[PDB]
Amino acid sequence: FVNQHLCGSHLVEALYLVCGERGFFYTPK
Amino acid sequence: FVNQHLCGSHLVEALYLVCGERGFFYTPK
Amino acid sequence: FVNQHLCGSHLVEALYLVCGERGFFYTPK
Amino acid sequence: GIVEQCCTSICSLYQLENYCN
Amino acid sequence: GIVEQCCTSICSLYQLENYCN
Amino acid sequence: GIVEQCCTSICSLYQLENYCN
Numbered sequence: 001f002v003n004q005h006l007c008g009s010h011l012v013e014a015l016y017l018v019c020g021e022r023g024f025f026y027t028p029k
Numbered sequence: 030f031v032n033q034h035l036c037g038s039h040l041v042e043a044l045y046l047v048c049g050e051r052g053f054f055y056t057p058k
Numbered sequence: 059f060v061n062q063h064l065c066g067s068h069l070v071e072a073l074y075l076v077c078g079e080r081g082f083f084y085t086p087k
Numbered sequence: 088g089i090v091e092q093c094c095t096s097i098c099s100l101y102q103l104e105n106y107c108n
Numbered sequence: 109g110i111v112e113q114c115c116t117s118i119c120s121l122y123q124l125e126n127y128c129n
Numbered sequence: 130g131i132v133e134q135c136c137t138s139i140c141s142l143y144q145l146e147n148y149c150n
């Protein structure tokens with residue numbers, strides 16, 4: 001089950017863009 | 030159903046490369 | 059079945075990072 | 088978490104913004 | 109459309125080129 | 130191969146390193 005792993009890759013790219021100079025936290029529960 | 034959403038991300042990258050200086054249209058029906 | 063195709067895209071990015079100046083081989087069996 | 092929220096349905100930019108610092 | 113054509117089977121570079129300007 | 134090994138389960142960085150030159 002690498003679907004979540006690959007989804008997560010896209011999520012971090014999207015958060016980089018969204019969050020900007022605020023930056024973000026990435027915490028897989 | 031984020032599978033189409035993530036597929037689309039890869040499609041746009043591929044069209045950037047394919048289309049070159051022509052550019053492209055991305056229209057999810 | 060584009061799941062393998064899209065997985066492969068991520069694998070090559072990961073191998074670029076892992077392998078560094080050694081580089082890598084990508085051979086879909 | 089973000090993986091439960093956003094890998095089981097598409098998260099808008101507004102919903103992704105909940106995970107900014 | 110491109111999502112129907114190319115997310116249900118792998119599109120070659122030739123088939124992707126149908127979506128260039 | 131790498132697709133069989135690493136698209137059916139998550140490959141660690143150590144396991145990916147088997148495919149370096």
Ligand SMILES: *C(=O)CC[C@H](NC(=O)CCCCCCCCCCCCCCC(=O)O)C(=O)O
Binds near residue numbers: 088
């Ligand atoms: C494990 O998978 C999680 C189990 C459980 N469930 C949760 O859903 C997490 C809830 C706490 C996270 C913070 C919630 C933020 C405020 C929720 C109000 C809804 C309004 C906005 C909707 C949205 O999130 O987009 C757990 O206890 O963690």
Ligand SMILES: *C(=O)CC[C@H](NC(=O)CCCCCCCCCCCCCCC(=O)O)C(=O)O
Binds near residue numbers: 058109112123
């Ligand atoms: C909604 O999902 C689409 C419904 C319906 N079906 C279609 O397939 C779209 C057909 C029109 C798009 C332009 C078709 C281009 C020429 C098709 C000839 C086939 C030769 C090349 C094959 C290829 O596309 O790779 C609709 O009416 O839109």
Ligand SMILES: *C(=O)CC[C@H](NC(=O)CCCCCCCCCCCCCCC(=O)O)C(=O)O
Binds near residue numbers: 087133134
């Ligand atoms: C076609 O899909 C493959 C069929 C068949 N099966 C294989 O699994 C490939 C085996 C040969 C590849 C090299 C194997 C490396 C050493 C394996 C020892 C296991 C220790 C480490 C585990 C790991 O790989 O992470 C075939 O004959 O090719």
Ligand SMILES: [Cl-]
Binds near residue numbers: 036064
């Ligand atoms: Cl993906």
Ligand SMILES: [Zn+2]
Binds near residue numbers: 006010035039064068
């Ligand atoms: Zn992907």
